[PDB]
């Protein structure tokens, strides 16, 4: 008579039935005769096996020595101070699933297609999450074999074997290629609060969420783990909530606070992460369905590595991704069509702020950042790229505005792109560089703003479309940089440039018997890659009345009348020399101005 | 003795009283004798009628055939997999309320006033949410009768009949006009998780939240619904949480994933939505209190329509709204003072990326977007506006930076504004266009960067304040666009322009007996609307020693001395022709440079 | 037999044990014999003293007359409509703790160091939150004694007495200085919903959260409180969730909606706040550990003050902070390295939009804002700074793009920096101003774009590095501003400027017997600080065939041949005067063009 089943709630259900509406870990611990001090792996596995859809957990530290694999929807409601101690062997892994349903049966055109045919659409319906995936190694990028092409789509309609999807294709895919079509069954794994402990030797990421869509995470915190703290893998449309994901293990091939692995449409609106290596690593792995990362937006994040790599990262399978209003030591720039904007970027100890080491092609945008440097920037420039493989598309570096701080040096560079000597063939595609927007630099010395060249001078020409360096500011009067450094590739026939205009005035005084009156040669603060265009004009001094023919003639009745023909008497990459050529030799010394303007505008 | 009321908790309350602290749907189902497989409409209505303030729901799919109207605060705590199936007839509608309390009694000045008098302030206190609303059709915009002016305010203080409000008025409102003052009693309708199913024929939006303030939504997901998936209506200060709101119905007048209806101070920080038509529609309807939308900020969202409209939208009652770091197919630009920045914008099949179809006035800012095009852009330009009604204020298109991708064509345009032939009267206000910031375009052909003209050439002049096209890049050597296309309106007397400077060098060699030495005519890559300003100078070749009088004279003792007077011998919209005029005919051929610069700077 | 302890759940725990898994306020009220209508202070204190880690609260208004001090982790789960009425005396204060563990033992270099030695690292481990703090008054800024230097760090590793930390130092700290090292034990204080009422006389902030890290707040709302609605103090890595924090009290020294006090790494992604004074105040106080604020990012917020101060604020202990896509009446700009971008900024009644009143040094970035003005801007410029103390570093104002609206006036200024007469010594560091990006201004009159000067003209020179005003637009034909206003400091020897180029054309007609043919003097729309560089060229009219020697010669066999030597005949700050000097006096009148270009480019 003393059972909860014998007690009647006013509704007519029993007290047992009231109790059954809420699942608690403690009832399971009692029933399974597992103490809260013992490994609870079998208990967590039993709760999920029982199909419990929401589990409340009392605040304790619990041993969890197993890898707990959630494959159905599950929600934790954990009290603060609930900690799962995975030791050397445990972890949580929450995953949806895929199946290969068909193959591609029409060609997909990058940035254009919104539909494709399949061999079999019988298992496809509107709203499905499909994966287009090429199983061929290097099919996205030549840098790593597992950089394979693909993307996630949501089905808009099916008509026969024609699948219309929302949006536009991010890549080209051919019928003739090994293109498989997967269908995803996503998981909805939820938690208000999840806090974990692992040793630095535990090879399991404390939490992985895999094949999930349309979600915002709860609070997550880890201590330990060998490789990464939190991984979001093959996820689609999600926001990362503020967290304490970290890695503090001895250096290995990963060491990531958060790893965003093969995800699409991923924001991180504010937070901080610290790691032995990358704090946020954007990349992934090489299993079936591990698509390139794209449409990433990280904002307001403070991201640091303890070793001399970058806090913020983009691997070579990452495109269409931005860090905005973030702080990082160093930065990696991914495949292309990526951006760092409004960021505070600290130079690495090994020189340079931004590295392009796995370039595929597209734009590399550096918009209104603040850069903090201290090295001479002689071995690595502020922004440095090394092309070791053929590009898929033309590469453009676009540095628009911002503030470059430091001392610089006689050999410092702002943007340098080199072809590796290991790429022993001419580069098919082109490089462009665009530096603009009133970016300032307080270096005491700077060798160049932009340079692009092969790794062996005179081996190959690196094709260049255009280089624009049109609106930059060196704040120090000792700085004397090239706008564009001259060498074979930057001087090749078809290269077009815009190089910042300069202008000035110089007072000259003619002397008796002059047939020319020449300013001294003018050494330009900013040097061009080649002799610039030069305009020279002559005019009166401020504070003097308007010239008439009496200024240069002793008697205006005497003809020919003397006039000052303005010319540029000498031009070099680094020099102009305004002068006057007289039509009759000077009799009376006169003081007046010569004006000049230099520039290059070829595209 | 077997009642929960007979069992004593250690606190001294009964077990029934413990149970009563938490409301569950299952107790209601039992007590009301409604099976969980039956329509639960009467149960939900009874729970809310009972004043339950927080309801826990067990994961099942529940039939809900009625429209459930929440008019008091209510909170759901739903297990994952809780689904409300509305079928053809059901939905949820959560609403606050309004009353008309008074009328406006002083004139309000746009961007200036922070107070207004009323006829009766007896029902107003500090902190109240008031609505200023004009009941007269077309009082905000001439495009649709229900585009009526008004705004939401919060009261800062009341002194007699003077209401001081926080902020500054967004519009002008006159005593003499039909201006009513409403007071809002907001609802606080909450959910952790809400997932719904409706047929595509169900005319109810699955969830509407109306007259709520100061909130962040929980997770929401719908399948089905005829018109829209989620509507936020007459809401004030809110953030939209990530969701799966959608529409997939046959095309009708709406088909919106999320509709933001008549809202003020509305962010959406990351997400994705797909719809038959607009994914996010910003607009609303025409009931009392349906103010213009303003102060919208959507960030990090991927927004697509299946039909050839736009994923991202702004209707003609929308101002002060931005999409930033979003992706969309096509784009609508609302009333004015709106922006798309840092967006990926795909061209519609029907040509063009951005449409201004209900313009009221103000700025239309396109900042650092990437545009993906494939059509010839001959019928609709990249950015295209049609003025069919008088503007309320001058209209400015400001395209600052970015990357324009595609092939273009011989008739392609970047920015075109036309007056409709249906507006058979001269336009009162002005149009301005400002294209700057180093925006690039890789078209093989382009007709113009900017053009503004009436729909019948020579009918009316469209007034233009200024057109600036000062810093653009056509990357292809085949492109030969007008900066500003010349026609009646762009050439009218009072129009002021800035048109990008060009410059170059040409080597010339004089011939024996020349009295002039003329470069061949130079055809400019970028064409002006009218003959540009031209500067010509003469100078030495690189690699040659500084000129003296011996360069152009066989014997410098013989006077007059020959000098090279530099001139521009011919000017056209598209041509310059530097030359030298000699003061005595040439005896010795000489090779030297002529330099030129063109530009227009009128404002 | 009627105890919950006598009833057995199916798990084997008693019904009392089931009940004990959830804490409710109502059980405490019963057991403590406190009615829900009485002061519940003793009940809240007992719940927290009992170590309850999660408390559920039924919706009622509860009297709380005490200041409830949470010093251990605590979580509320409050029903909507739960209100804590603090009256005149109550409040909530949730705090972590600190201890001074050691002192600094090596010098730290701003923007460079990532490690420091301590006197004792025995209490330090990896992951610890440490505070570096200088106890000396004015050690961050000279404006207020409690502006002391320091920062928060997280430990990466400890080796002996060497502490490596994540990131890079934000300031310099010397061994020799009074630099203490604190260790923080943070609190995790959580709530879903917290709504409070206080009188306007209650000196307690309704909620303070102090010494917490890695969190996102829940929903918070207050009515009342004398000084501020919500304070986040000495917090590290957090996001502020949307809220209704406010202040409506009579003006005092604070009156803040939200006060961010001495915090680091703080985002606010969307919201609205209203206050008597600042809506969001960023600053803090002067206790041990009250570091400068840094790494703030507020986005999508509508922020207003009722009095004529600013809605958005940054005090003089704030650096590295941005408001983006926000709306405010007026704005304060903090210490430096701060930004307002993409904001709508309303002019205060007392003139001006943006105030720099406690400058320390660094950049003050105003990027793409829209400014709404109505005063003549004669007493305070749009952007105005007053230097009353020595700067720590050079100060740069960088106004890049945007839209300046209003009438202006004959004395209006855009950027003005003045040295106070109260600073009766020469300023050590420099001021720079950079105005660019195509910023527009629709004023009918404007005196200057940029001016920097001492408070007594001719007393001291304010050192200026550079002033650039290179790309601005006055849309009105009546506006005639100086680019840079000329006075002692802006004209001093070492000052370098870039001042926007101008150019034009004028047709002239020679007359019989001319020895010169002079255009009338040209009055420049934009005036320079000093006589500009001037280029003059001569050329043919549009529509005329290419010039040859016949244009200026009646018989080309007669030598010398007449040629038109182009010159600038007069230059002033505000004037040019193109002319031709003839080598033989004119016989036949000719009509032709003179062209001119002006500019200054000195850095
Ligand atoms: C747990 C373990 O030890 N696994 C072995 C390891 O597996 C590798 C392999 O699957 C590659 C393709 O992915 C993972 O390592 C990447 C890593 O994700 C980073 N890449 C990107 C784009 O973010 C990093 O930069 O590169 C490594 C890498 O290429 O090794 C994965 N590692 C882990 C720890 O999960 O290696 C191999 C193997 O054959 O090389 C087999 C095991 O599964
Ligand atoms: C449920 C229904 O069928 N209602 C009928 C429909 O009502 C219209 C009407 O209230 C207008 C003013 O608003 C709604 O339609 C708008 C719609 O919100 C969009 N506008 C904006 C600015 O976002 C769209 O672009 O235009 C339509 C429109 O103008 O029709 C509302 N429709 C719905 C489905 O709620 O039409 C009428 C009627 O008299 O025209 C009456 C019914 O209430
Ligand atoms: C509750 C109270 O009345 N406290 C007295 C008050 O305390 C001041 C003092 O601690 C200063 C350093 O901080 C607080 O006032 C600041 C305030 O935070 C703002 N500053 C910034 C940078 O945000 C504001 O602009 O300035 C005031 C100020 O300097 O007074 C604090 N006030 C409060 C209400 O907490 O004053 C004194 C005192 O000796 O001056 C003692 C009391 O603790
Ligand atoms: Cl004169
Ligand atoms: Cl002569
Ligand atoms: Cl020489
Ligand atoms: Cl001709
Ligand atoms: Na710019």
Ligands, deduplicated: a molecule of 3 linked components (49S-49T-49V), chloride ion, sodium ion
Number of strands of chain A: 47
Strand residue percentage of chain A: 35-45%
List the chains of the largest interface with their residue counts. Answer: A-B, 94 and 95 residues
Class by helix and strand content of chain A?
A: mainly beta
Number of domains of chain A: 3
Shape field of chain A: elongated
Assembly annotation = homotrimer
Distance between the termini of chain A: 93 Å
Organism (chains A, B, C): Acinetobacter phage AP22
Domain Tailspike protein-like Ig-like (chains A, B, C): 94-184, 501-597
Domain Gp49 pectin lyase-like (chains A, B, C): 223-478
Protein name (chains A, B, C): Tail fiber protein
Task: Report on the architecture of this protein.
The structure is a homotrimer of 603-residue chains. With 603 residues, chain A is mostly beta strands. The first copy, chain A, has three domains: 22-96 and 187-500, no CATH class; 97-186, no CATH class; 501-603, no CATH class. In chain A, 4% of the residues lie in helices and 44% in strands. Chain A has four helices and 47 strands. The first copy, chain A, has a six-stranded parallel beta sheet. A six-stranded antiparallel beta sheet of chain A has the order 8-13-10-11-12-9, with no helix packed on it. In chain A, a hairpin with a 2-residue loop joins strand 11 and strand 12 (162-165). The longest helix of chain A has 9 residues, at 41-49. The N and C termini of chain A lie far apart (93 Å). Chains in contact: A-B, A-C, B-C. At the A-B interface, helix 1, strand 11, strand 17, strand 20 and strand 23 of A face helix 1, helix 2, strand 18, strand 23 and strand 25 of B. The complex binds a molecule of 3 linked components (49S-49T-49V) (3 copies), chloride ion (4 copies) and sodium ion (NA). Residues 545-546 of chain A line the site of one chloride ion.
């Amino acid at each position: 008579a003393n059972s909860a089943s014998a007690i009647l709630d006013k509704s007519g259900i029993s007290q047992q039935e009231v109790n059954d509406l809420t699942a608690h870990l403690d009832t399971y611990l009692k029933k399974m005769n597992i103490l809260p001090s013992e490994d609870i792996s079998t208990v967590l596995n039993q709760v999920k096996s029982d199909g419990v859809k929401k589990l409340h957990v009392k605040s304790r530290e619990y041993i969890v020595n197993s890898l707990i694999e959630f494959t159905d929807d599950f929600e934790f409601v954990n009290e603060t101070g609930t900690v799962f101690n995975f030791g050397d062997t445990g972890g949580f892994y929450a995953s949806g699933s895929h199946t290969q349903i068909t193959t591609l049966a029409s060609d997909i055109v990058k940035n254009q297609s919104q539909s494709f045919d399949v061999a079999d659409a019988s298992q496809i319906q509107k709203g499905d999450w499909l994966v287009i995936y090429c199983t061929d190694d290097f099919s996205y990028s030549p840098y790593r074999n597992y950089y394979r092409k693909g993307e996630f789509v949501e089905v808009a309609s099916v008509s026969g074997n024609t699948v219309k999807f929302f949006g536009r294709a991010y890549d080209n895919y051919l019928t003739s290629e090994n293109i498989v079509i997967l269908k995803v069954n996503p998981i909805n794994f939820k938690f208000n609060y999840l806090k974990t402990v692992s040793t630095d030797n535990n090879p399991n990421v404390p939490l992985v969420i895999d094949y999930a869509r349309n979600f915002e995470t709860g609070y997550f915190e880890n201590k330990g783990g060998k490789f990464a703290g939190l991984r979001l893998r093959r996820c689609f449309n999600f926001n990362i909530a503020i967290n304490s994901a970290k890695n503090n293990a001895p250096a290995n091939t990963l060491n990531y606070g958060i790893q965003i692995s093969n995800c699409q449409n991923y924001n991180y609106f504010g937070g901080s992460n610290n790691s032995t290596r990358h704090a946020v690593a954007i990349g992934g792995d090489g299993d079936l369905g591990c698509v390139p990362c794209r449409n990433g937006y990280v904002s307001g994040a403070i991201l640091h590595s303890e070793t001399d790599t970058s806090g913020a990262d983009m691997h070579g399978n990452v495109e269409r991704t931005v860090y905005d209003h973030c702080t990082t030591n160093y930065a990696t720039f991914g495949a292309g069509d990526n951006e760092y904007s409004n960021c505070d970027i600290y130079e690495r100890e090994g020189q340079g702020c931004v590295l392009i080491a796995e370039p595929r092609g597209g734009e590399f945008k550096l918009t209104n950042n603040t850069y903090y440097t201290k090295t001479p920037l002689n071995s690595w420039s502020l922004v440095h790229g090394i092309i070791e493989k053929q590009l898929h598309e033309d590469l453009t570096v676009k540095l628009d505005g911002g503030c470059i701080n430091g001392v610089g040096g006689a050999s410092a560079g702002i943007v340098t792109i080199r072809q590796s000597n290991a790429l022993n063939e001419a580069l098919t595609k082109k490089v462009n560089v665009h530096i603009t927007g009133g970016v300032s630099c307080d270096f005491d010395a700077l060798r160049h703003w932009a340079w692009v060249e092969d790794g062996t001078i005179g081996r190959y020409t690196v094709p260049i479309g255009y280089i624009i360096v049109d609106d930059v500011v060196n704040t120090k009067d000792t700085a004397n940089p090239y706008l564009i450094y001259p060498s074979q590739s930057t001087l090749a026939t078809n290269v077009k440039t815009r190089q910042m205009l300069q202008q000035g005035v110089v007072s000259v005084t003619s002397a008796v018997n002059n047939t020319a009156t020449r300013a001294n040669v003018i050494n330009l603060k900013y040097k061009y890659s080649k002799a610039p265009n030069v305009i020279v004009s002559v005019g009166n001094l401020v504070g003097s009345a308007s010239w008439d023919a009496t200024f240069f003639n002793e008697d205006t009745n005497v003809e020919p009348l003397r006039t000052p023909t303005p010319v540029n008497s000498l031009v070099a990459i680094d020099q102009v020399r305004p002068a006057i050529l007289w039509n009759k030799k000077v009799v009376t010394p006169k003081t007046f101005n010569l004006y000049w303007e230099s520039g290059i505008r070829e595209i």
